[PDB]
């Protein structure tokens, strides 16, 4: 399996991309468990910039409500966690 | 707005998924002080497992040939970096 440079570049270049976020881990908030799943997948800006000085950052955002099953043995309740999801990204000086 | 639970879950569940891998100086003999792209995207095992202790690991993998433009001012030429890409994953006990 050989991947063409174009496909490699276009795909590695700064843009929004599904990222895994660890619940009870990423955001210091709620470091406790009982969550199913204990992590979620959310679009974010990732990749690299044509310059070692630039950085990949959002230029379009919005919160997404992720339904998360919360559990305390007898009762399992579908709760809702919210987080920042990116829709547009750009390369720019990490000053 | 709101992502259903039977969506949050089936996406967050351990599986192969595009992952951005930085191209550190690890590239030996790669004179080209400038790699383009400076990173690549590759399917790996990510997400989470229905319990602490277990982990997400590959049960199917293989090396992929990433065409990478190498540069040393005079000019540049297409190189080819190779890394493991996961094709199957599973949640297994802690090592």
Swiss-Prot record, chains A, B:
<feature type="disulfide bond">
    <location>
        <begin position="14"/>
        <end position="56"/>
    </location>
</feature>
<comment type="function">
    <text>Growth factor for endothelial cells. VEGF-B167 binds heparin and neuropilin-1 whereas the binding to neuropilin-1 of VEGF-B186 is regulated by proteolysis.</text>
</comment>
<protein>
    <recommendedName>
        <fullName>Vascular endothelial growth factor B</fullName>
    </recommendedName>
</protein>
<comment type="similarity">
    <text>Belongs to the PDGF/VEGF growth factor family.</text>
</comment>
<comment type="subunit">
    <text>Homodimer; disulfide-linked. Can also form heterodimer with VEGF.</text>
</comment>
<feature type="disulfide bond">
    <location>
        <begin position="49"/>
        <end position="91"/>
    </location>
</feature>
<feature type="disulfide bond">
    <location>
        <begin position="45"/>
        <end position="89"/>
    </location>
</feature>
